Design a protein around this motif. Structure first.
Motif, PDB file in Angstrom:
ATOM      1  N   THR A 298      -3.348   7.355  -2.882  1.00 24.17           N
ATOM      2  CA  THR A 298      -3.852   8.082  -4.084  1.00 24.17           C
ATOM      3  C   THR A 298      -3.634   7.199  -5.317  1.00 24.17           C
ATOM      4  N   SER A 299      -2.441   6.618  -5.438  1.00 26.00           N
ATOM      5  CA  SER A 299      -2.015   5.770  -6.579  1.00 26.00           C
ATOM      6  C   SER A 299      -2.745   4.418  -6.538  1.00 26.00           C
ATOM      7  N   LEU A 300      -2.843   3.778  -5.367  1.00 27.47           N
ATOM      8  CA  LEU A 300      -3.565   2.487  -5.241  1.00 27.47           C
ATOM      9  C   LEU A 300      -5.025   2.708  -5.649  1.00 27.47           C
ATOM     10  N   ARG A 301      -5.644   3.800  -5.177  1.00 30.69           N
ATOM     11  CA  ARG A 301      -7.047   4.154  -5.531  1.00 30.69           C
ATOM     12  C   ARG A 301      -7.171   4.321  -7.054  1.00 30.69           C
ATOM     13  N   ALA A 302      -6.210   5.001  -7.673  1.00 26.83           N
ATOM     14  CA  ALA A 302      -6.254   5.388  -9.107  1.00 26.83           C
ATOM     15  C   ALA A 302      -6.356   4.110  -9.953  1.00 26.83           C
ATOM     16  N   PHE A 303      -5.548   3.101  -9.611  1.00 23.85           N
ATOM     17  CA  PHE A 303      -5.459   1.808 -10.341  1.00 23.85           C
ATOM     18  C   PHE A 303      -6.656   0.921  -9.998  1.00 23.85           C
ATOM     19  N   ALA A 304      -6.898   0.714  -8.716  1.00 24.25           N
ATOM     20  CA  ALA A 304      -7.855  -0.300  -8.229  1.00 24.25           C
ATOM     21  C   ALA A 304      -9.291   0.203  -8.418  1.00 24.25           C
TER      22      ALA A 304
ATOM     23  N   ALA B 156      10.720   4.160   2.885  1.00 29.28           N
ATOM     24  CA  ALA B 156      11.013   3.092   1.917  1.00 29.28           C
ATOM     25  C   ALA B 156       9.702   2.354   1.630  1.00 29.28           C
ATOM     26  N   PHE B 157       9.312   2.247   0.362  1.00 29.40           N
ATOM     27  CA  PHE B 157       7.982   1.663   0.020  1.00 29.40           C
ATOM     28  C   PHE B 157       8.069   0.135   0.146  1.00 29.40           C
ATOM     29  N   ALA B 158       9.272  -0.437   0.062  1.00 24.50           N
ATOM     30  CA  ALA B 158       9.479  -1.895   0.214  1.00 24.50           C
ATOM     31  C   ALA B 158       8.621  -2.636  -0.826  1.00 24.50           C
ATOM     32  N   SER B 159       8.023  -3.776  -0.473  1.00 26.94           N
ATOM     33  CA  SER B 159       7.268  -4.618  -1.441  1.00 26.94           C
ATOM     34  C   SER B 159       5.886  -4.007  -1.749  1.00 26.94           C
ATOM     35  N   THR B 160       5.479  -2.907  -1.094  1.00 26.76           N
ATOM     36  CA  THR B 160       4.188  -2.224  -1.418  1.00 26.76           C
ATOM     37  C   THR B 160       4.206  -1.779  -2.888  1.00 26.76           C
ATOM     38  N   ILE B 161       5.388  -1.460  -3.432  1.00 24.78           N
ATOM     39  CA  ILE B 161       5.556  -0.985  -4.840  1.00 24.78           C
ATOM     40  C   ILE B 161       5.015  -2.035  -5.824  1.00 24.78           C
ATOM     41  N   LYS B 162       4.955  -3.303  -5.414  1.00 28.77           N
ATOM     42  CA  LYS B 162       4.555  -4.423  -6.310  1.00 28.77           C
ATOM     43  C   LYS B 162       3.109  -4.240  -6.768  1.00 28.77           C
ATOM     44  N   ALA B 163       2.243  -3.701  -5.918  1.00 24.16           N
ATOM     45  CA  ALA B 163       0.836  -3.427  -6.283  1.00 24.16           C
ATOM     46  C   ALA B 163       0.795  -2.402  -7.423  1.00 24.16           C
ATOM     47  N   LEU B 164       1.543  -1.306  -7.305  1.00 17.50           N
ATOM     48  CA  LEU B 164       1.549  -0.249  -8.346  1.00 17.50           C
ATOM     49  C   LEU B 164       2.213  -0.802  -9.611  1.00 17.50           C
TER      50      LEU B 164
ATOM     51  N   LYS C 223       2.771   9.699 -15.066  1.00 14.95           N
ATOM     52  CA  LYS C 223       1.585   9.784 -15.967  1.00 14.95           C
ATOM     53  C   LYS C 223       0.266   9.614 -15.194  1.00 14.95           C
ATOM     54  N   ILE C 224       0.178   8.796 -14.138  1.00 10.71           N
ATOM     55  CA  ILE C 224      -1.133   8.616 -13.426  1.00 10.71           C
ATOM     56  C   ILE C 224      -1.338   9.709 -12.380  1.00 10.71           C
ATOM     57  N   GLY C 225      -0.339  10.574 -12.158  1.00  6.26           N
ATOM     58  CA  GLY C 225      -0.483  11.739 -11.265  1.00  6.26           C
ATOM     59  C   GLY C 225       0.366  11.625 -10.008  1.00  6.26           C
ATOM     60  N   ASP C 226       1.287  10.659  -9.946  1.00  3.96           N
ATOM     61  CA  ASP C 226       2.124  10.416  -8.737  1.00  3.96           C
ATOM     62  C   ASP C 226       3.506  11.024  -8.983  1.00  3.96           C
ATOM     63  N   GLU C 227       3.761  12.193  -8.392  1.00  8.31           N
ATOM     64  CA  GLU C 227       5.071  12.898  -8.454  1.00  8.31           C
ATOM     65  C   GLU C 227       5.897  12.547  -7.206  1.00  8.31           C
TER      66      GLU C 227
ATOM     67  N   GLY D  20      13.850  -1.338  10.102  1.00 10.19           N
ATOM     68  CA  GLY D  20      12.620  -1.946  10.648  1.00 10.19           C
ATOM     69  C   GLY D  20      11.402  -1.416   9.919  1.00 10.19           C
ATOM     70  N   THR D  21      11.521  -1.201   8.609  1.00 10.75           N
ATOM     71  CA  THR D  21      10.419  -0.628   7.806  1.00 10.75           C
ATOM     72  C   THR D  21       9.363  -1.723   7.653  1.00 10.75           C
ATOM     73  N   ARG D  22       8.104  -1.416   7.990  1.00 14.38           N
ATOM     74  CA  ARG D  22       7.003  -2.415   7.996  1.00 14.38           C
ATOM     75  C   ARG D  22       5.720  -1.739   7.532  1.00 14.38           C
ATOM     76  N   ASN D  23       5.277  -2.108   6.331  1.00 20.79           N
ATOM     77  CA  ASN D  23       4.276  -1.340   5.555  1.00 20.79           C
ATOM     78  C   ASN D  23       3.098  -2.230   5.154  1.00 20.79           C
ATOM     79  N   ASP D  24       1.906  -1.628   5.121  1.00 21.75           N
ATOM     80  CA  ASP D  24       0.737  -2.290   4.485  1.00 21.75           C
ATOM     81  C   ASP D  24      -0.113  -1.227   3.779  1.00 21.75           C
ATOM     82  N   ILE D  25      -0.431  -1.457   2.501  1.00 24.89           N
ATOM     83  CA  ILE D  25      -1.452  -0.659   1.758  1.00 24.89           C
ATOM     84  C   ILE D  25      -2.654  -1.547   1.436  1.00 24.89           C
TER      85      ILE D  25
END
Ligand SMILES: *C(=O)[C@@H](NC(=O)Cc1cccs1)[C@@H]1NC(C(=O)O)=C(C)CS1
Length: 256
Positions: free
Chosen positions: A155-161, A36-44, A121-125, A208-213
């Motif tokens: 890969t996606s965070l790198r593509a944008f940032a 589950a990507f949780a709130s990490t999706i907010k960056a993308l 479109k940015i390459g994230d399947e 207990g999903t706990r994520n950081d990108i």
């Protein structure tokens, strides 16, 4: 076996991918395991918003009501009467993990379906956005709605940032927001020596999903892009921020 030790010490499953953009050297552990990507999706999500709009277009004021407020609204719950600009919502989503801010922005790009389309479109399947807050929190093991992988998020965070999905002025806005995140001091930031700049977006969800990108800048050198994802066996399980911090320490050890 340092990552297996952390899974052993914290009774959790751990998803690691790190890319040193300076050597293309890689650190990986269950890098293709879905979480589950949780709130990490907010960056993308801000990534796609920035693609879709001019900087001056972020000054558009969004009107909302209590009905747009969901379970966690630390900035949005304050400004129902005034509304908030898309830029202010971007700030609230990224720096405070304001769930309502994310929902409003998502509805601004045309919803989870529209977000998925722009991610393809940015390459994230891999990343599968499907639902709004609060429903994207409930991911049972084996289901792929609202999930990604450490490799895909990096890969996606790198593509944008860091690459060419955005012009430099828009990359600066995203990177500045993530650098001044208020929610991440106990996670990737806590495994990186003081003085090193860190841009990050946290998430927490069920099982207990706990994520950081993160993007991590050494004083000089090219940046590291890192995803630390984790999950536990039980639906109501607690997480420990210290898992993410220690996992981050192991990555930097392996790359230095
Ligand atoms: C994304 O991860 C968001 N999580 C939720 O809305 C689910 C939960 C609500 C209460 C406990 S879990 C927001 N982000 C974060 C974060 O990024 O750290 C937290 C702490 C919960 S709200």
């Amino acid at each position: 076996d340092d990552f297996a030790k952390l899974e052993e010490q914290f009774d959790a499953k751990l998803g690691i991918f790190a890319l040193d953009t300076g050597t293309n050297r890689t650190v990986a552990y269950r890098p293709d395991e879905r979480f589950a990507f949780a709130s990490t999706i907010k960056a993308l999500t801000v990534g796609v918003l920035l693609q879709q709009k001019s900087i001056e277009d972020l000054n558009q004021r969004i009107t909302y009501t209590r009905d747009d407020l969901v379970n966690y609204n630390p900035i949005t719950e304050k400004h129902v009467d005034t509304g908030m600009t898309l830029k202010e919502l971007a700030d609230a989503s990224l720096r405070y993990s304001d769930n309502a801010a994310q929902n409003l922005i998502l509805k601004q790009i045309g919803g989870p379906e529209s977000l998925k389309k722009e991610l393809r479109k940015i390459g994230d399947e891999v990343t599968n956005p499907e639902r709004f807050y609060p429903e994207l929190n409930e991911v049972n093991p084996g289901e792929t709605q609202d999930t990604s992988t450490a490799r895909a998020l990096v890969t996606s965070l790198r593509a944008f940032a860091l690459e060419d999905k955005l012009p430099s002025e828009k990359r600066e806005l995203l990177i500045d927001w993530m650098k001044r995140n208020t929610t991440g001091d106990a996670l990737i930031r806590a495994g990186v020596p003081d003085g090193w700049e860190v841009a990050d977006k946290t998430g927490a969800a069920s099982y207990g999903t706990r994520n950081d990108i993160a993007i991590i800048w050494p004083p000089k050198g090219d940046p590291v892009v890192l995803a630390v994802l984790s999950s536990r066996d039980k639906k109501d399980a607690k997480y420990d921020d210290k898992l993410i911090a220690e996992a981050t320490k192991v990555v930097m050890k392996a790359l230095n």
